[PDB]
Design a binder for this molecule. Structure first.
Ligand SMILES: CCn1cnc2c(Nc3cc(S(C)(=O)=O)nn3C)nc(N3CC(F)(F)C[C@H]3C(C)(C)O)nc21
Lengths: 267, 291
């Protein structure tokens, strides 16, 4: 289907097809770590969690974090035999490219080197950024997991949107992204299934166009993650110093999500 | 980069240096955009990362093709399809005789098709102006310089082609900013001079008000609430479009006034403009499936 309304600026059939085609051409592999035998999935989760932490410290957008996450996973699928000592460099360089692209006044190169405590220099980040961009074939315009949540919220509050509900769903998506198994599902299905866990099947079909059958396997995979978030209660909307109050929902936040990931991975 | 021979330097600006070049083997003529990296503390410029990534995904006959991206120690070359001239040079060259109306119609039609493609990908060009419109000897015109191009965006184009909502402090950009620039360019092609040649933001706004009239809540609801709106703005009557654009027919004046509408929400879209009776001759009827 297609959940877009009649658009003035363009034909909704074309706008929606291009978006579906973007998800077609941008590929993700839930088994990319098999190409790196010295690496285990808990390393990816710890690295992505760390990037989320540095994102909040610099008031970086959630799109900036998801651009870095996508660049990391996609770049790692073009590589082989990577050691865990190189993972911090690949991660902070993915974040550097993303901040340059998404932020208006991104943090400076020395600030990206700083958060690594000397394990990464500015020169290394500049060498690595060119390696990542060239290996990704300059394909740096993905539709992130969080951009789909944004699309769904825009459609829901048309038929601007509320900040509190957005951050609760985003908080569930942040927990899921730490598990490489999430990469089995298209980004639009992960966001549709996170939205379902906070509403209904009727609402997700209305804002995403997906049918229940489409998101069902993803919903049953997300069930432990969603339950761990429900047990503890959802987070409250934070205020960010020097950030407009109509944009606070779009700022990346951090939580003790690694223990929540262990509870969801057990069941 | 060893397989390229620089023929001539076409320009230098914030984009870097653009050259005309030849593939020593192939024999093809390309446009090269050179970007210095050794002089960049923040690495590959954000504006170059965005342009490259965007053009890899924006393939259209009226958008300059990015053929390749070569990294050569402290340099980054972007190999583009070559075009012989920019619209400003062409317009100045044709200023005494005038650009023939059929060519103005053709260039506008192609511009709107390129713009409609960009907008269907949710991309705002943000910097539409004559020196960014590249023409060739085979009758084509293509959108160039996607450095300021943002996918929808908040407000932070050279004055003459800037939409009134931008000058009046609107917080968010829309697709209607590109339409405004095309209307200015369309009128410039017709009148052989800039429609609104201001020398400051206030001068630009007053020049727009002298031709279209000072806007009110009736023509543009929200205008008086806007950040840079002043109640002291002189009251100007909207000039008759038969004087603003004399060589234009009834269908031309209709399209131009729809592209220059004050209200961003009512300004004609690129797709809707392509279906205007001004291009009845250029456009072909397509059957609609209701379903
Ligand atoms: C890179 C894409 N591309 C392909 N063909 C051209 C091209 N062709 C051109 C313009 C004229 S002029 C000035 O004398 O009208 N001569 N030639 C041969 N000019 C440009 N320009 C003109 C510029 F000054 F160098 C800036 C650059 C721009 C940023 C707008 O893309 N870019 C081209």
């Amino acid at each position: 289907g297609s959940p877009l309304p009649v658009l003035s600026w363009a034909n909704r059939e074309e706008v929606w097809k291009i978006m579906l085609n973007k998800e077609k051409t941008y590929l993700r592999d839930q088994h990319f770590l098999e190409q790196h035998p010295l690496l285990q999935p808990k390393m990816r989760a710890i690295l992505l969690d760390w990037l989320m932490e540095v994102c909040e410290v610099y008031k970086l957008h959630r799109e900036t974090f998801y651009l870095a996450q996508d660049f990391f996973d996609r770049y790692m699928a073009t590589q082989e035999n990577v050691v865990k000592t190189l993972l911090q460099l690949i991660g902070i360089s993915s974040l550097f490219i993303a901040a340059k692209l998404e932020e208006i006044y991104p943090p400076k190169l020395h600030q990206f080197a700083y958060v690594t405590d000397g394990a990464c220099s500015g020169d290394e980040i500049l060498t690595m950024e060119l390696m990542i961009m060239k290996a990704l074939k300059w394909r740096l315009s993905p539709l992130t997991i969080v951009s789909w949540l944004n699309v769904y919220m825009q459609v829901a509050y048309l038929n601007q949107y509320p900040q509190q509900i957005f951050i609760q769903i985003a908080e569930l998506l942040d927990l899921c992204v730490l598990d490489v198994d999430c990469l089995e599902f298209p980004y639009g299905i992960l966001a549709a299934s996170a939205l379902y866990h906070f509403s209904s099947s009727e609402l997700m079909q209305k804002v995403s166009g997906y049918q229940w059958c489409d998101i069902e396997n993803c919903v049953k995979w997300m069930v432990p993650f969603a339950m761990v978030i429900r047990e503890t209660g959802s987070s409250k909307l934070k205020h960010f110093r020097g950030v407009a109050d109509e944009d606070a929902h779009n700022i990346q936040t951090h939580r003790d999500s690694l223990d929540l990931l262990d509870k969801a991975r057990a069941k | 980069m060893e397989n390229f021979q620089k023929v001539e330097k076409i320009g230098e600006g914030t984009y870097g240096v653009v050259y005309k070049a030849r593939n020593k083997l192939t024999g093809e003529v390309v446009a090269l955009k050179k970007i210095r990296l050794d002089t960049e503390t923040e690495g590959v410029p954000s504006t170059a990362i965005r342009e490259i990534s965007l053009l890899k995904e924006l393939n259209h006959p009226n958008i300059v093709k990015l053929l390749d991206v070569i990294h050569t120690e402290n340099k980054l070359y972007l190999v583009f399809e070559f075009l012989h001239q920019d619209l400003k040079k062409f317009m100045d060259a044709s200023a005494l005789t005038g650009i023939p109306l059929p060519l103005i119609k053709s260039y506008l039609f192609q511009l709107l098709q390129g713009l409609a493609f960009c907008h269907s990908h949710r991309v705002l060009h943000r910097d539409l102006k004559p020196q960014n419109l590249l023409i060739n000897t085979e009758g084509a015109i293509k959108l160039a310089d996607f450095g300021l191009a943002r996918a929808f965006v908040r407000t932070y184009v050279t004055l003459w082609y800037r939409a009134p909502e931008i000058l009046l402090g609107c917080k968010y950009y829309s697709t209607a900013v590109d339409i405004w620039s095309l209307g200015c360019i369309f009128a410039e092609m017709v009148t052989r001079r800039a429609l609104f040649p201001g020398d400051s933001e206030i001068d630009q706004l007053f020049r727009i008000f002298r031709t279209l009239g000072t806007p009110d809540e009736v023509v543009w609801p929200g205008v008086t609430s806007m950040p840079d709106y002043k109640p002291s703005f002189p009251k100007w009557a909207r000039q008759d479009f038969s004087k603003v654009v004399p060589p234009l027919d009834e269908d031309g004046r209709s399209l131009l006034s729809q592209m220059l509408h004050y209200d961003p929400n009512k300004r004609i879209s690129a797709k809707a403009a392509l279906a205007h009776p001004f291009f009845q001759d250029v456009t072909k009827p397509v059957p609609h499936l209701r379903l």
